[PDB]
Each structure stands twice: as structure tokens, then as C-alpha cells.
Amino acid sequence: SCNCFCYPCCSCX
Amino acid sequence: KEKFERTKPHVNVGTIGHVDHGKTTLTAAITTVLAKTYGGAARAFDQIDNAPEEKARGITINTSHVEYDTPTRHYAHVDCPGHADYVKNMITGAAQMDGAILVVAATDGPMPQTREHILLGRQVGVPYIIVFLNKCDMVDDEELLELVEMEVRELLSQYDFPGDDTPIVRGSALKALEGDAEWEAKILELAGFLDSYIPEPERAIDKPFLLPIEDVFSISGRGTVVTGRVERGIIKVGEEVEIVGIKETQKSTCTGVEMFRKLLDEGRAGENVGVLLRGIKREEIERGQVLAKPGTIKPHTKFESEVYILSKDEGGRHTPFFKGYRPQFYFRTTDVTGTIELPEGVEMVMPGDNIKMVVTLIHPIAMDDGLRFAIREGGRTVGAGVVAKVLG
Ligand SMILES: Nc1nc2c(ncn2[C@@H]2O[C@H](COP(=O)(O)OP(=O)(O)O)[C@@H](O)[C@H]2O)c(=O)[nH]1
Ligand SMILES: [Mg+2]
Ligand SMILES: [Mg+2]
Structure with a gap:
């Protein structure tokens, strides 16, 4: 998921 | 040049x-x-x-x-x-x-x-x-x-x-x-x-993998993802991980890694990633636990530390604290209440003092000697410490 340059986030599938 | x-x-x-x-x-x-x-x-x-x-x-x-x-x-x-x-x-x-x-x-x-x-x-x-x-x-x-x-x-x-x-x-x-x-x-x-x-x-990338958990969410029919900044090492798709601290230690496998909405074969030290976990439910994992290379980190409740108490000017407390002080200990991504034991013959710790403190947390957290932490209390940072010796 969910970030894009540097803040917490994600995904995986 | x-x-x-x-x-x-x-x-x-x-x-x-x-x-x-x-x-x-x-x-x-x-x-x-x-x-x-x-x-x-x-x-x-x-x-x-x-x-x-x-x-x-x-x-x-x-x-x-x-x-x-x-x-x-x-x-x-x-x-x-x-x-x-x-x-x-x-x-x-x-x-x-x-x-x-x-x-x-x-x-x-x-x-x-x-x-x-x-x-x-x-x-x-x-x-x-x-x-x-x-x-x-x-x-x-x-x-x-x-x-x-x-x-x-x-x-x-x-x-x-x-x-x-x-x-x-x-x-x-x-x-x-x-x-x-x-x-x-x-x-x-x-x-x-x-x-x-x-x-x-030893470079952080060559140390055993460790990721402090921040957010946790489910991808329907694919499993639970945990987000965090990789603290050290590398996690690879297919590698096993331990989920350490707060609750009983669990085992899982990394089945995916994502950064900036790009799916990767690995997560590296310093990267803000999401890690997809095999067979872990959303309610079985929480903020403050860590993902780590199996056997490389243990949960502890009691430790010896060296702590520095912020002065008034640094925005810390204006008055000393005493034995009975039960503040919050900030470890990586969460806080935990702990009870403190001061050195023999010490009744108060003045703002600006540094002292050895023996702490007993209300629940375990993943820790090793050298781990830094902050001390916070309603609702400011009053101290900073380092784990000197893990006691159990
Ligand atoms: N005679 C002599 N004086 C020195 C030497 N090194 C430092 N000093 C002097 O000692 C004083 C304090 O040195 P300084 O480098 O500021 O010490 P610091 O507080 O440890 O950084 C200064 O007057 C320096 O010039 C040395 O090798 N010989
Ligand atoms: Mg100097
Ligand atoms: Mg002498």
C-alpha cells in the first residue's frame, strides 16, 4: 500492500 | 577519485x-x-x-x-x-x-x-x-x-x-x-x-533477518500480510520465519514480498515492505511482534539496561521519578509497561541523570543485548535506554 516511495505499507499476492 | x-x-x-x-x-x-x-x-x-x-x-x-x-x-x-x-x-x-x-x-x-x-x-x-x-x-x-x-x-x-x-x-x-x-x-x-x-x-544486510511488525491485514484466500521496515538481513520467498514476542512464538513461511505495489522475490534491510505469510490468521499476529530468522531472537520480560533521563530543556520531565514508577517501554513498533529496580541506595532519578535500571515488562518482547528503547509517560518521551543484559 500500500505504499509507494517510503511510508509503511504493502501487499503480497 | x-x-x-x-x-x-x-x-x-x-x-x-x-x-x-x-x-x-x-x-x-x-x-x-x-x-x-x-x-x-x-x-x-x-x-x-x-x-x-x-x-x-x-x-x-x-x-x-x-x-x-x-x-x-x-x-x-x-x-x-x-x-x-x-x-x-x-x-x-x-x-x-x-x-x-x-x-x-x-x-x-x-x-x-x-x-x-x-x-x-x-x-x-x-x-x-x-x-x-x-x-x-x-x-x-x-x-x-x-x-x-x-x-x-x-x-x-x-x-x-x-x-x-x-x-x-x-x-x-x-x-x-x-x-x-x-x-x-x-x-x-x-x-x-x-x-x-x-x-x-558486519553489515546490517548480512545479519539474521529481522522485521518489526507494524500493520497486519488479510488478502482474501491468500493469507495475512505484515508491514514493516526490514531492520536487518534479507527475507526470501519460500524461507521460514519465527514470529517472536508478546504471545507464544509461532512459525510460518514467507510466500510473498511487496514494496511500492511491486512484487519482489525478497525484502532487504532498510526497505519498507509487506510480507505475506503462509497459514497465519490475522488475529494470530500483532504490532510489536517481530518476524525473524528461526532461532536468532528470543522473547524476554526482564533485563538490565543503561538509561538516560531527558532534562527539562530536552522536553523531558521537570521533576525526578521514584521507585514505583511504572512507565511505558517503547520497543521497535510497540510499548509495554514495566516495573523498575533502581541501584542499591537510589531513591530518585533526576532529569538529566543516566543510571543502570533493571526492568520487568508485563509481557515478553523479542530482544537481545544492544536493543535500544524509549521510556514514555502520559504523554511524552522521558527517557532512552539500551538493553545491557537480558535476564530471562
Ligand atoms: N601540550 C599538549 N596540549 C594538548 C595536546 N592535545 C591537546 N592539548 C591541549 O589541551 C586542551 C584541550 O584539548 P581538546 O582537544 O579540546 O580536548 P577535549 O575536550 O578532549 O576535546 C587544548 O588547549 C589543547 O590545545 C597535546 O598533545 N599536547
Ligand atoms: Mg572536544
Ligand atoms: Mg590517577
Whole structure:
């Protein structure tokens, strides 16, 4: 998921 | 100029020891002699002495950073004006020290901050110390020189450093800085010991994988993802992980990694990633737990620490705290209440004090010696600490 340059986030599938 | 590629091994060092023993003069001497001999930028006393303020873990510290090279290695070096700056830097880990240069004036011998910096060095995990016996231009005898050397070795051994094996350079930071070839040679000797005695430190990427968990969410029919910044190491798709702290330790497998909405085969140290886990439910994992290489980290509730309490000016408490103080301990991504045991005969801790504290948390968290933490209380940061010894 969910970030894009540097803040917490994600995904995986 | 190839040095712009930064391919040489990198070592973080610094000058420690009692006020006025010559730490800043030695720092200027090291940059100047190494610039003349091998090439680099020389730094003057005034530039290093006028240390800018820098914020650590919510704490203001005055720190000067310099860099210098030897033919085989690159050094980043820290030097600070006051003893309080060394206390704060060492406890917070704001300045990394792969090795320390303990400066001892031959004229005064070991002094109270000499002992305190060796003691803190041991508690915070400074792994190696080399000694620069300074102001030898003021001591023409040998009975006092061999005596101070002997006292320094015993002092280092008193705090578990190998005093007998410690390189001790007898020099004059001032005379080398003034360009005297005989004294400049003692600076080259010191730099040679930086090269030979301080081993190349282990890079965060080569350490066992660790990720402190922040957010947790499910991807329908694919499993649970945990987000965080990879603290150290690498996680690869297909590798097993342990989920450590707060609750009983669980096992899982990394089945995916994503960063900036791009699916990757791995997550690396310093990267803000999401990690997809096999067979873990959303409610079985939480913030503050860590993902780690199996068997490399354990959960603990009790530990010994070195803590620095913020002064009023640093935005900390205005009044001391006492035994009975049950504040929140901030570890990586969460906070936990703990009970504190102060040293024998200590009833209060004043703002600005640093002390050894034995803490017992209400629940376990993944920890090892050297882990930093903050102390917070309704609703500000009152302290900063480092785990000195895990107790169980
Ligand atoms: N005679 C002599 N004086 C020195 C030497 N190194 C430092 N000093 C002097 O000692 C004083 C304090 O030195 P400084 O580098 O500021 O110490 P610091 O507080 O440890 O950084 C200054 O007046 C320096 O010029 C040395 O090798 N010989
Ligand atoms: Mg200084
Ligand atoms: Mg003495």
C-alpha cells in the first residue's frame, strides 16, 4: 500492500 | 577519485575520554596527517570543536562528524564537546561505534569520565577500544608514562576489555597537528591500529533477518500480510520465519514480498515492505511482534539496561521519578509497561541523570543485548535506554 516511495505499507499476492 | 564509488571497507569510530584530554585536537590531527600522507580533506580544531546539534531518539546531542581514509579503509568518526553528549550518543546509538579511540592525557592519567566512558562502552556494546596516550610532549620521563599505561590496561580489564592486548599509542595530538614529523608518525601508528585491530564490522544486510511488525491485514484466500521496515538481513520467498514476542512464538513461511505495489522475490534491510505469510490468521499476529530468522531472537520480560533521563530543556520531565514508577517501554513498533529496580541506595532519578535500571515488562518482547528503547509517560518521551543484559 500500500505504499509507494517510503511510508509503511504493502501487499503480497 | 575512484573513492566516490565507496568500495573500500567502512568503519565507524570516535574519540572518547575525559574533558580536555585532547579528543578534538587528536581528531583534527588524524584528518590532517592522513590528508598529507595519503590524500584527503584536512579538518581544523575549530571546525570539529563547534559541534552542531543533532536529534537522536527525541534527544538533542552536540556531535561533530569527520571522515578520513587510510590506504585500505574508510573511517566515519564522531567527536563531541561534553561528557553528556557521550552519555546520550552511547546510550541512544545515535553515533555507531565499531571501535572507540580512548584519549588519556599522560599529564593527568585516568580521570572520572575516562572510567565512565569505558564502563558505558562495555554496557552499550562498543566492541573494541584502542588508546591514544596524549600530551606525551609534556612528560619527558618513563616512570610516569609506563605507570599511566599500566593504570589504563587495569582500568580496561576492570570493565572486561582486554587490557593486556590493547594497542596503546604514546603521542602528542597538538605537536602532530603543528606538523612535527616525529609526532605525526604516532598518528600514522594510531591509524595503523584502526586498520589492524578493529575488524571490519558486519553489515546490517548480512545479519539474521529481522522485521518489526507494524500493520497486519488479510488478502482474501491468500493469507495475512505484515508491514514493516526490514531492520536487518534479507527475507526470501519460500524461507521460514519465527514470529517472536508478546504471545507464544509461532512459525510460518514467507510466500510473498511487496514494496511500492511491486512484487519482489525478497525484502532487504532498510526497505519498507509487506510480507505475506503462509497459514497465519490475522488475529494470530500483532504490532510489536517481530518476524525473524528461526532461532536468532528470543522473547524476554526482564533485563538490565543503561538509561538516560531527558532534562527539562530536552522536553523531558521537570521533576525526578521514584521507585514505583511504572512507565511505558517503547520497543521497535510497540510499548509495554514495566516495573523498575533502581541501584542499591537510589531513591530518585533526576532529569538529566543516566543510571543502570533493571526492568520487568508485563509481557515478553523479542530482544537481545544492544536493543535500544524509549521510556514514555502520559504523554511524552522521558527517557532512552539500551538493553545491557537480558535476564530471562
Ligand atoms: N601540550 C599538549 N596540549 C594538548 C595536546 N592535545 C591537546 N592539548 C591541549 O589541551 C586542551 C584541550 O584539548 P581538546 O582537544 O579540546 O580536548 P577535549 O575536550 O578532549 O576535546 C587544548 O588547549 C589543547 O590545545 C597535546 O598533545 N599536547
Ligand atoms: Mg572536544
Ligand atoms: Mg590517577
